[PDB]
Structure formats: C-alpha cells, structure tokens
Design a protein around this ligand. Structure first.
Ligand SMILES: *[C@@H]1O[C@H](CO)[C@@H](O)[C@H](O)[C@H]1NC(C)=O
Ligand SMILES: *[C@@H]1O[C@H](CO)[C@@H](O)[C@H](O)[C@H]1NC(C)=O
Ligand SMILES: *[C@@H]1O[C@H](CO)[C@@H](O)[C@H](O)[C@H]1NC(C)=O
Ligand SMILES: *[C@H]1O[C@H](CO)[C@@H](O)[C@H](O)[C@H]1NC(C)=O
Ligand SMILES: [Cl-]
Ligand SMILES: [Cl-]
Ligand SMILES: [Cl-]
Ligand SMILES: [Cl-]
Ligand SMILES: [Cl-]
Ligand SMILES: [Cl-]
Ligand code: NA
Lengths: 543, 534
C-alpha cells in the first residue's frame, strides 16, 4: 500500500471476481470499535430476462476497483396489507423498511447483493462469519434493513446480510418441470458459495460459518440444513422463531396459486411451458401487485418439495439425519401468536366463551381440515386450552388462545426439530425468550411476540438513541443485548454459547430437555411447555 | 338402679345401660343396643318391604347387640379387597362382630349423652351392600363429645337386602326400605330419648354414603331427615346401582335349584331356601360392578340417580360431602415393585383394562384409551416410576370417587342449597399401609367417631399421636356443628366456606386445615365434560 491512510479509510479487498472498495465506519458507542462496511456486493448475475424463474448464476468479473459503499437495490416486493402473512410480521418490520431509501424507491429485479461488516479489531487468525437470512414471510424484507455493525464489532465476528429473490420471483412453481421453484433458496445457497470462496479475502474463516435467521428466514435456515446443496457451506445454524415444519414453511399447492396468478395477468394458456414463458416476460409490477390469498395459515408462494433442492417432506429429511452434521441453536418467544386474537379482545382485555369456541373451531378447519375424528379433535383442543381452575376469567381465556396458536405454530415444531436433531448426540441448544422492549403500539397484557428477540441479537440498544426500531430502550435492554450477543457469537466461535467469552446454557437432549429461559434473569429450566408439546406431537397425530 | 335406664317407646319400655367412658371429662352415655325397628323379615316377608315391629308388655332388655344380617366373608372378592384397612384386612378381630348372624336382624343401637331436644346423627355402614354392621361403630365418643344422639343401624344385606328379578315378583331395595323404616321409627320414637326429630342428620361411608345419596333422591325419605353427610361414596359410581339385577338373580336361582322361568314361582322357591344356601354361593359381577344392590325400581328409586338429581329431589337437604386423597389405593395391588414404582408396561395394561371394565366399548374406545393415557402421564417427568404409581392411584380415585362427588355437589349447590365439600388428606400410622400411600378408602372413619380419644382398639388398627387426637376433635366439631345448625362453623375452627359451582371452595382436612378451591378441577372436567364426547 502506497497511500496508507486511504487504504485504511476506504479499504480494498480482492475477491475472485475483482477488487471492491468499502468504507471504514466508526460506531457512535464509545466502547465499540469501527467496522469495515462493504455494501452492495454482487454475489450472482442479475436474475433478469431469461434468468427470471431460473437458478442463479455466478456474477461477472470486472477490472479496476468497484465501489461497494452503499446499499444496492432491494428485491421487488408488495403484499396485501390485510394479508394474514402481512399481519404476522414483527411490530418493527414495516416502519423500519420505510426508513430505507433503497426500499422506498430502489426496488429492482437486479437485486442479488450482500452486505459485509468486518471488525477492525486486530487478532495478535481468521474470524468467524455469521450470515443472516431475513424474514418477511418469503414475500417482503431485505438484508439492508439490518445493520450488522454492532454485532460484528461487539462479537469480533464478520456479519453478512443477504438479499434473495422474494415472492413470485423467488418461489413461483408449477409443480412440474416448467418452473421448479425454490429460486430464493438457491440464491441463498449461491451467496453461501460466494462466501465460502471469498470471505478469506476479508479475513474470514470459511470453516467457521454460522447461518441464522428469524421468522421465514429461520424456515429458510431450517430448510438449508436439510438440503444436499448446502453441504460444506456452513457448520452451524441458529434458528429464531421459525421451522421447516410449520403450516406456512412449505407450499404444498404451488400449481393452484401460479394458475390464479396467470389468469389475473393475461397468461390464461393451459400449457405450463407457454404459461411460464408468458409470466417470464411480464412487467414485474404487474406480477407483484397481484393479491393471491392462500388458504388460512398457508402460503401462496414459497418453498416447495421439488425432489432435488428439497427432496422430500422436511420431517422425513430430519428423520433421515441430513441436519446432524450441523451444530444448532433454536428457540421461540413466549407469545409469538399475539395476532391470533386480533379483533376478539374487548376493552377489559378479555375474550368471551363464544369467541373462544369459534376461534378453536376455525383453527381446526384451517390446520387439520378433515382428518379421522375431527369432532373429537376440536373438543379435546377446547378442553386442553381451557383453564378449569378459573374458567370464567375472560383475560385468562385470551391468554390460552394466544398460547394455542403459539404452541401449535412455533413451540411444538421447534421442539420436534430439537428432538430430531439431538437424538444421537449432535450439539443442540434450545431457548425460550421472555423479554420485549417498551413499544406504545403493543398492548399492555402482551408477552414477548413474534420478532421481539431481533433487537437484542443485533445490539440495537447499544446504537445510541433510546427511541429506535419501534422501541424505547432501558439500561436493562442494553445488558440483555450484551448477554444475547455473547451467547450468539460464542456459539459462532466454538459451537458452545458458553465459550470462550464470559449463566451456563446447558445442551438440549430429548431426555432432560434443558433449555435457556432468556430474559432479565437468564436461567436454565427443563421440559418447556411439556404437556402441551406432548399433546401436539404425540396425542394429536392419533386423533 | 340408674345403671339401667328405662325408656318408654311407642312399642313398649326398653332397658339400656349407663356406660362410663374411659375419659372422665367426657360424660357418661346411655346405650340402648339391639332395639327392634321393624318385624323380622322372615318367611313370607323375605324379599318384602319391612313392617313395623310388634309391641310388647313389660320391660324388654336392649343391653347387648342383636344378631347381624347374614353375610359371607370372602377374600376372592374385589368388593372385599376394596373394604377399609380396619374393616376386613383385620380378620378374626372383625369376625367378633359378624359371627352371630340371623335373618332376624332389623335392629338399631342408640347412644344418648347424659349432659332441650338433642340433634340426632344416624349412621349407615358401608361394606359394598354385602357385609358389615352398625355394631362395629361405637357411637359413645361422638355422642358425648358432640352432645348429640348417635344411632347406628343394621339393614338387610346382599341377596336378602337387594335381590331383584327386574319385574314385579321382586322389586328389590329391601335394604334401603329398611333404612327408611329405621328413620320412621326414629322420627316417631327418638323424642322419648331426648332427641329432636326435626334435627336428624343421616351419614355414611363407602356403600353407606351411596345409600345416603340414594335416600336423598327418594320420595320415601321425605320428612325423615334434614341433613346428610356423604363420605367417600355417591349414587353415581359404577358400583352404586345394579343395572342388571335379573341376570345375577338367575345365576343364583340356577345354582340353588330354582330353575323355573316364571319369576313369581322362582322368588317363592327362593323364599323356601335356607338363607345359608343363598349367601354361600359365589356370584361374581362384572369388574367394578355389583351383583346385588340398589336397583332403579320405578318407585323407591324412580329413575337414574343423575336424572333424580337434575329433577332436584335432594335440593331440600343441607349436604356435606367429600373424598379422601388416595381412595383408589387397591387399584395398584400387585404392580408396585420394591422401589415403590410401576413400569410403563403395567401402566398401559392398567389403563387398557380400566377402559374395558368401565367403558366397555363406547363410540371411540381407542381414542378414549389413548387420551386417558395422555392425561395421566407426567410429561415433565415421564420416566419416574413412583410418579407412574401415583397417577394410577389418581386415575381410579378421580373416576370412581372425585368426579362423581363433584357432579353431586354441583347439582346440589346449583341454585343456592347449602352444600359443603371436603378433601381428606390424613391417615393414622398403620404398619399394613405402605409408607408412600396417601389417605385411603375408610381412613376418615376413626376421626369421625373419636377413636384417637380412647386409643388403638382391636378394629382400628392404627397407632395414634397427639395430632390424630386434635384432628378427631376438629372433625367431630365440624360434623356435630353441622348436625346442630346446618353450618359446620356454628354450634348454636378454620371457617369452612360453602361450596358452589362458581367458586368451588372446599376444605382441605388434615393437620393444617384450610380452605382451597377447584379440587382436581382439570381431571374432574376431563371426566365430566370431555369424556362423554370421546
Ligand atoms: C468511489 O466512491 C468515492 C467516495 O465518494 C468516490 O470519490 C469515487 O469517485 C468513487 N468511484 C467511482 C468509480 O464512482
Ligand atoms: C335383662 O338383663 C338384666 C341385666 O343383665 C338381667 O338381670 C335380666 O335377667 C334380663 N332379662 C331377661 C333375660 O329377660
Ligand atoms: C403400633 O406401634 C407398635 C410399637 O409399639 C408397633 O409394633 C405396631 O405394629 C403398631 N400398630 C399398628 C396397627 O401399626
Ligand atoms: C418511547 O417512550 C417515550 C417516553 O420516554 C414515548 O414518548 C414514546 O412514545 C415511546 N416510543 C415507542 C416507540 O414506544
Ligand atoms: Cl454480475
Ligand atoms: Cl428479519
Ligand atoms: Cl404445558
Ligand atoms: Cl318385632
Ligand atoms: Cl362404615
Ligand atoms: Cl387436576
Ligand atoms: Na466507537
């Protein structure tokens, strides 16, 4: 280096595709060191024209030095704001999205970019790498929305956020060879390949890559641990409030929704090859502006069992042992399913016996459909989710309904995953998350909800302002963020959330079933919601 | 001499005895033993309702127990293995009471304290309708301690009390009608003993509690008592009522040479048999059921007890009822290992058999079996073999005692009739009880009758401490306050709140008595609400 100061302030890295120039970025927090930011790094060719509804290809090489100093365009996205998938998004998701200048007026089908946050800290070795897969129900979001600077600086790990194709463009499938689906997953895989080959140039360790995600990102992470395409690309996974086993994780009726789309957009031809080519040439505004409403608690565009990328049912893939070679941390938040009681809560924060019966009846219609012994099943669910010690209390009735949806959609599938992963000694760690930041939009009576661990994972309380991310942070929030980031980055470094940086988080196994209660008072407990989980995992599959 | 008090009854004068009690600060008691309350149910009056007794001239001695009703003591029986540890598990020391038997057995015993007209507590013994006697309970301590008259009764048992053809040849329920006739006698005569016929409480344990429950639901009981205490039994359990009397009467009649198909001829033939010929026969009912007991006759018991309760027949009475923590102890006989545990195989076997025996085959038997297995598994400690033992005791206790007691209480308290509920959580030290066992079937009886205030007796079967003495005083005060006022808190203690279906307040009775709520509410709702849909 000749101009050593320029080389420090505007660091240049030589990738396999050419040189890029990033930005050394100080962090306002006095005790956090600067990070190098490389924003808008292309990891694949633009999936445009004939590459729409096709797997991603490697990016083009270049000569000279390419600036990677600001966020690239976001993947095209729209979704009906009354959609159940839209209403299940975190309380902070939309407001934070609208903060992004790239989101607001820089959507582009050319969107396969990633963002890299490198600690400037000097190890006097190669740093662990944490790769984040954002949520948003497969339809919305961007890696740009998460600043990985503080996690990187606090943990002395490289943090990478990725953009992958969303919605129709990422997941359209015909259920046959014309459009095999899973484009967004293949994008994630191609990012991980790029990372494997290029992260060494940033001082990163390809042999210590952890993938992590929340919501639909956690479903993606779970699905990647079960695909042969992912092998040798990462060694650890953290799975936050999502799984491969939930009703909205996989689309079992892709052809139906693709046809509904085609007909809304002037592609009424029956031949699937011609229909796909017609959609392939449609202006993308036309496509993403359509409202294709799935059956309740299901998805219209998302991952499919294609027989290749996802060879079979996720339960079967877990039973066959695909994910056993990864160390896995996974968990849930106490009241993920808060939106389940949207509409049915009164001004005294209660629900009526009538509302309860209706809600359970609709739950069974939508999630079980018409199984052997449906009437028995509905009755047994009502019984299990009634508090017989206080059966006239309307506020308790509200709580049990949130519990029903939380248990079924998040808790039982997480525990099933944990049990399938831990059953032969593969390292497994389970958490239940009990804290949430103060937010005026949230009801007083609400527990930790869907997306509420995310501010703690990314160290947002340390950024500076008390009022950010739809939160009002306290000193306890700062402490809890530090606890969480230490566990998460320790895990990335060693596969053990207790090592090397200093309460002991014990390993999960199906026998003792130890889990970390994460809150202001972290503590190891056992058999999380054991009776309700056993209900869903053991009794119900016979009713 | 004052040692031999004479009382004029409506039928003639009787001589009893003034008995000192070992304790000097408990008053003496006058005892009138073997008082006839009905004519002998013999000859043509076998299998007929009881008639009033005959009058007599002069003074008739009522100075010793009369002969008990015929009964066989059989260790092959489950209705025998069911009986309290004190009842029959002590053998040659119970035979003391049951050796002098006679079909002429319609006698009662009266215990009058010597301290206005006194309340009267009338006790109906248990023994599965098949065995026992009032003579086995000495009412002297309860009477003297509570300042109430205590009366124990003998009623026809087994075949002679309960044989029925299921038609008009033998309508059944002779034993219940005996109890009614004793209550009539008491209503008409107890005044001569200083008793108040307007303050009569009936009480019973086990099958005696089932009898009490059934009497609250019979129009024949009207005007004979105002209060009931119902200890560890109901009208609603599988062994309370015989829904198949003709079957078992036919089996008996065939063993004994009464093979006629005409039921009038079969009954008259049975009348001609020696009673010993009858009580000797092994007649084995379906498991958890009875061969000879109360029947739905259309008269004494017009309909299913559930239906009688919903029509409100017992709404006039003030009722105290309860159960013991671990009633169903015998359910796990033979499957508890030397470390007090039960295996998962023995758990699955017990539950499966439980369902075969109590549900037979309802709409969805497999669903039912798997659901019961789920509900009685401790999913937070799935491998613990001692917990597995506890949950089996709980299964049987919940089904046979707790759920039907709560159903009875709810139906009684529904529209504001005074109702009190208890759960009994203490038992005396006994070497033939396992160290891990909770309060079992019959374990409240020594406390109700003040047995710790005398000491270990032959029948009980207990070593007693200071705590047992105090618990007896607590129980006797509640029981006798209730007989006095209808309120266990008032004579003219921890406050025992009324039971209603909303708040569901009950008294935890033990060394630390206290009011709690919603006793085993989840398990009770399982049996009462969900299961009838499975
Ligand atoms: C790269 O960014 C820097 C910083 O603003 C700018 O001076 C330089 O001209 C940029 N290079 C190109 C090719 O845009
Ligand atoms: C009544 O009992 C007394 C006291 O034992 C006795 O003196 C008398 O002979 C008895 N009367 C009879 C048997 O008629
Ligand atoms: C009472 O205690 C004695 C010790 O004096 C013991 O031998 C006996 O077995 C106990 N009795 C019962 C019924 O448990
Ligand atoms: C943050 O708390 C302040 C009071 O300190 C309040 O005015 C504001 O509405 C809160 N913001 C959120 C997003 O909860
Ligand atoms: Cl490119
Ligand atoms: Cl996210
Ligand atoms: Cl639970
Ligand atoms: Cl007579
Ligand atoms: Cl008794
Ligand atoms: Cl319970
Ligand atoms: Na700083």
């Amino acid at each position: 280096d000749d101009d050593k100061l320029a080389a420090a302030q505007y660091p240049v890295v030589n990738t396999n595709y050419g040189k890029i120039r990033g930005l050394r970025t100080p962090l306002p927090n006095e005790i956090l060191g600067p990070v190098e930011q490389y924003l808008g790094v292309p990891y694949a060719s633009p999936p445009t024209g004939e590459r729409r509804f096709q797997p991603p290809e490697p990016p083009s090489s270049w000569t000279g030095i390419r600036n990677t100093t600001q966020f690239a365009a976001v993947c095209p996205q729209h979704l009906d704001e009354r959609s159940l998938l839209h209403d299940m998004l975190p309380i902070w998701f939309t407001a934070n999205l609208d903060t992004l200048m790239t989101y607001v007026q820089d959507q582009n089908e050319d969107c396969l970019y990633l963002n890299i946050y490198v600690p400037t800290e000097d190890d006097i070795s190669k740093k662990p790498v944490m790769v984040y897969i954002h949520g948003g129900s497969y339809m919305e979001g961007t890696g740009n929305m998460i600043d990985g600077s503080i996690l990187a600086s606090y943990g002395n790990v490289i943090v990478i956020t990725i953009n992958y194709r969303l919605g129709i463009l990422g997941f359209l499938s015909t259920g046959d060879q014309a459009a095999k689906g899973n484009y967004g997953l293949l994008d994630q895989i191609q990012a991980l390949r790029w990372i494997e080959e290029n992260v060494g140039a940033f001082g990163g360790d390809p042999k210590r890559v952890t993938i992590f995600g929340s919501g639909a990102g956690a479903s993606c992470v779970s699905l990647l641990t079960l695909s042969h395409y992912s092998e040798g690309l990462f060694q650890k996974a953290i799975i936050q409030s999502g799984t491969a086993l939930s009703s909205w994780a996989v689309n079992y009726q892709p052809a139906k929704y693709t046809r509904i789309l085609a007909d809304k957009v002037g592609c009424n031809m029956l031949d699937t090859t011609d229909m796909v080519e017609c959609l392939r040439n449609k202006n993308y505004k036309e496509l993403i502006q359509q409202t294709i409403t799935p059956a309740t608690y299901h998805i219209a565009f998302g991952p499919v069992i294609d027989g290749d990328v996802i060879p079979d049912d996720p339960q079967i893939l877990m039973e066959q042992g695909e994910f056993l070679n990864y160390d896995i941390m996974l968990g849930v938040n106490q009241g993920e399913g808060l939106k389940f009681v949207d509409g049915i809560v009164d001004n005294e924060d209660g629900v009526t016996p009538n509302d309860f019966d209706f809600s359970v009846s609709n739950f069974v219609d939508n999630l079980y459909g018409y199984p052997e012994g449906k009437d028995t099943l509905r009755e047994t669910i009502k019984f299990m989710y009634t508090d017989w010690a206080d059966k006239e209390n309307p506020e308790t009735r509200r709580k049990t309904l949130v519990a029903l949806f939380t248990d079924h959609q998040w808790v039982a599938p997480a525990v099933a995953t944990a049990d399938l992963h831990a059953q032969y000694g593969s390292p497994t760690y389970f958490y239940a998350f009990y804290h949430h930041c103060q937010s005026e939009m949230k009801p007083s009576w609400a527990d930790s909800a869907h997306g509420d661990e995310v501010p703690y994972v990314f160290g947002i309380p340390m950024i500076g302002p008390t009022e950010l991310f739809s939160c009002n942070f306290s000193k306890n929030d700062v402490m809890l963020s530090a606890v969480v980031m230490t566990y998460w980055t320790n895990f990335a470094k060693t596969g053990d959330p207790n090592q090397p940086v200093p309460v002991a988080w014990s390993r999960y196994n199906p026998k003792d079933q130890l889990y970390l209660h994460i809150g202001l008072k972290p503590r190891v407990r056992d058999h999380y919601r054991a009776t309700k989980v056993a209900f869903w995992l053991e009794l119900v599959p016979h009713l």
